């Protein structure tokens, strides 16, 4: 998912891949997209 420039809806984009120098190694990048964070709702549990 990537945040759209105009619409307030995340658009779906195809992940990149590795085609730099080696055909023996293939994968897709995972550090792409928007950086999500998670926050508490009521702060009722233990801070520790």
């Amino acid at each position: 998912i990537k945040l759209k420039k105009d619409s307030p809806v995340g658009e779906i984009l195809t992940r990149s891949k590795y085609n730099q120098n080696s055909k023996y190694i293939n994968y897709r990048d995972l550090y792409i997209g928007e950086k999500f964070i998670i926050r508490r709702k009521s702060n009722s549990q233990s801070i520790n």
């Binding site: 055909k23 023996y24 293939n26 009521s42 702060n43 009722s44 549990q45």
Partner: protein
Amino acid sequence: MNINDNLSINSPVDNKNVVVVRARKTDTVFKAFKVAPNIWVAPERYYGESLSIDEEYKVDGGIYDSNFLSQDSEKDKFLQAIITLLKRINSTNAGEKLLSLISTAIPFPYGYIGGGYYAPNMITFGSAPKSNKKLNSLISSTIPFPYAGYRETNYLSSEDNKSFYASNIVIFGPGANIVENNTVFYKKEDAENGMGTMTEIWFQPFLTYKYDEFYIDPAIELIKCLIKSLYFLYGIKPSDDLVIPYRLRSELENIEYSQLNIVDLLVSGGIDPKFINTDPYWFTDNYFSNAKKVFEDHRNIYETQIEGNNAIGNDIKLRLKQKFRININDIWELNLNYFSKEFSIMMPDRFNNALKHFYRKQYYKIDYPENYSINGFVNGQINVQLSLSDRNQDIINKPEEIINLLNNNVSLMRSNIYGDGLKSTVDDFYSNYKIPYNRAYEYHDSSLDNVNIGVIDNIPEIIDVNPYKENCDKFSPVQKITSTREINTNIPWPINYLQAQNTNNEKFSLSSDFVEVVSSKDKSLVYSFLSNVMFYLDSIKDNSPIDTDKKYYLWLREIFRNYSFDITATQEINTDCGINKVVTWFGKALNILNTSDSFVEEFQNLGPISLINKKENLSMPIIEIYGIPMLGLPLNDLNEKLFNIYLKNILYFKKVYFNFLDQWWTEYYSQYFDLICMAKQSILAQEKLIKQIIQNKLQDLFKADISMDKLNLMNLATEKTFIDLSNESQIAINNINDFLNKSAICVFDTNIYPKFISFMEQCINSVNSNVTAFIQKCTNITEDEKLQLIKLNTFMNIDFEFFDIQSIKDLITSETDLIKEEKESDYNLFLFTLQEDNNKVIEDISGKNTLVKYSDSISLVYGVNGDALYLKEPDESVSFSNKAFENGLTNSFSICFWLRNLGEIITSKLIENKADNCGWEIYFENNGLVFSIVDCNGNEENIYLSDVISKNWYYISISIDRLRNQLLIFINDKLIANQSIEQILNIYSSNTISLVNENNPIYIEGLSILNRSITSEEVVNNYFSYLNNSYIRDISGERLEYNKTYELYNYVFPENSLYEVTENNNIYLSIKDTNNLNIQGAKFKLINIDANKQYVQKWDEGVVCLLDEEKYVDISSENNRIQLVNSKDTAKRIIFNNDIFMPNCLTFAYNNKYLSLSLRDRNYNWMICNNNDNIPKAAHLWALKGI
């Protein structure tokens, strides 16, 4: 794409959608109906093949009839069937994409009459009239002279040879052989040279066949034909000599192979293509390179020449664009597996091109607006009711081999073994095939993505067609004669045993002596391996004849139990690849290792290889490992070159491994699949005999003094028992399937992989020698550096070790297996409730689609885990309807739900399935439940489950297992009742389970009915996992909530409530003394940081408030006890938790220190923050009761 469904055989010939064209350049014409752009249907039979072939030329397993599709009614039915199939294909997105690609993939048109696809000539027309001063001779209009002159080859010519209609696909009827779908090109030269050609399809939509436990959808056969036609449309058709080894003919006495064309392998799908389409490729031919080059040439011709031409039409220019949008690899990587997955259609998955040899097909007739539809088969692919076609008697049977079991020279038995029907080669393909080194040395479900339905639909139809004179060649039918050898043997074959297990009489008797069965002059003995059933029948022999209904019920139950025990007999042994459940009776049926002792003993002592009769079929492929080419280079360049050589050699080793895997699949797994098929035939034969014996007994008992109603009860019970016998046969079938699949994987592990390791060790020796020689010939590097380099480029054994049992288990599992796994459910009813937003929905999500009828007075609450039905209004009812709920004599089931009664003590009905007298029911009584089951003979079983009081959750699980004659009843996580129901007989009841309230507000949660019995371990697991939902509960079982008056109890003392004690000007709370039991307990409340939270959860910080001065809990660091203060800020924030195995009990923690009860102290027990182990670990568990 939109299929023209408004056509019929009575429609007039309008020369636009209904035409009468000429078949090739013969003297015969045929009608044709256009159902889509460039897609036509010819409802008559094919014209090329004569409908009356000589008897010596009929093929094995083919229905030959020269009267099919002769009347107009049959032709109209055929046309409607093809329309329905096309519409069904078009419904799914993938089918629509395939149809659009078929429509838009016109054969490549030729050039102009002089050659070329560039601009045409020009002509000036219409000179303006002469003016008063100017001649105006050159004032005219210039137009392209041969406009749209590209001479297309895809056209049908009318009977007058003056009108031409563009067309890509013509769907004829079947040729000489009724059940034979075929796909034939229009011109071979234009089909093999990248140009393209018209395609004709012979299709039979009216006859299907059954495989395993499902019927073949004809839509998938049509899809396969269309995919094969796509090969001709694009011109990528390999030569007929490009074949692959498909199967090893193990039934023969000579080493012969049955081979398949690469087109059929690439289109048919299944598991076979997975053993050739491998990364990296081990099988490569010049065909792929030539096809890619020719396709690229034609794409360039379009892009550079036929694209910018403004004097050709967009009817061709824009279809050629869409045709060349896709790549060739898209067509090659398009098989039946993708459409099977996207359509959820189960299809034969192993050796689907050789199903003629494995078993004989039975054909079922299809009435299209009765059985098929826009959504496919009615009532699914399994539960569709199709009548057996009357043409099954006309199936011609020409065996490939005749096995004669000679006695001592008299033929005791004569059996037929049929052939695959493919091309047979005696030359070993693998030994004469060389794995290429410099070819396919790279590369270490998404193919129809470049097809746009809307873009194809926007193309205008082709109206004006410029003919090409020579677009057809001829049709020469392939006439072949089937040879039949005869093999005389003394040792019986598995086919001989399989035949002996079949009889045509109706007064037979089971026998364990094969020789006696085949030597019986009366032909009254039938071979069977059911030792239990035979023993029981011999035991009851010479006894009182069965005349009463109880006697017949007992006999039927015993027969079913013995059959189930016999067909499901397996023994778990430890094999090299894990644990294998060997089928014990596999030696008796299909005589194999049937010398003496037990089959399992011989199987363990020997290997799995001994099951098949043709071992050691391996052959070393021709290996071409070229040595390294000696120009000087620095260290880095030499290192890079050697690394590249290393990677290439590793990939070559993997290619050889894949070749050996394909050898194992072709030569070894084929025999194991043959064993699987024969075992399935044996199981089915034994099931048929048991059913026939039961039918004989029932029909002989119809001539007795039994009332009619009891006779209908017998018939219903016998039908249910037949369903149960089918279920047991399916269990045995998949048991033997797993056994033999694991056996085949084990035989690869322990019989083929070592040979591959030996061969590649021998090869790696030479590879390392050559590498060392090359690295020593060079002299541009140092000595230590050279030693490091040569040590770095070495080939140990681990380099060429690629075995992975999980990669072979996951390689022989098809999409059909995944569909079966997804559709396999052990639930006859799995009720699911969903509140949504102001619209509650209660429905069965088990996949069996039980009819749920409920009133609007019911509510949905949160009882335990998810929403639960709440019946507060008196006299409510919820009905669940399903056929399987009718029960019967022999079927195991189980009811499982959560119950909470809010009442207080008369007998109120809770769950009923009582049809008049017979049935079963659960109802409240006194202060507990009662489960009563009664049969149709007067026998009753009433079980009183005590200690079920109101305002408490209970997990009721009742299991009836009729294979064990056992009735188990669990409440929560404790077995309550374990009874024997051997005295209980047929309990046939209504098809509706009724849940009532009877003036009692009740919570019912997760009501579930299974089709099998449950064990204690599974019940305990379900009970404990259902409560593991991060919610802290009270002693009542309901969710614990903040701000509620609660009484405190300790687990050690489940009846003493903590009460306030004042001493030394300090107030604590403590257990009540034995002399003071009437003192009222303390009232507690839980306060959280956020007042919005209402329900307590695991790991929640809170404060306990005691109900006049609003006391709060504090911990005194003088005696390490608790005390009560009058300041909220002085309270302690304690953490609430609970143990998974003590659900209705909770623990209070304070910096990793649980609060517990102290030892006795002058008739007191204070809550204290313990750190010592002398207090039992069960003393820190507390309970809160809603007061």
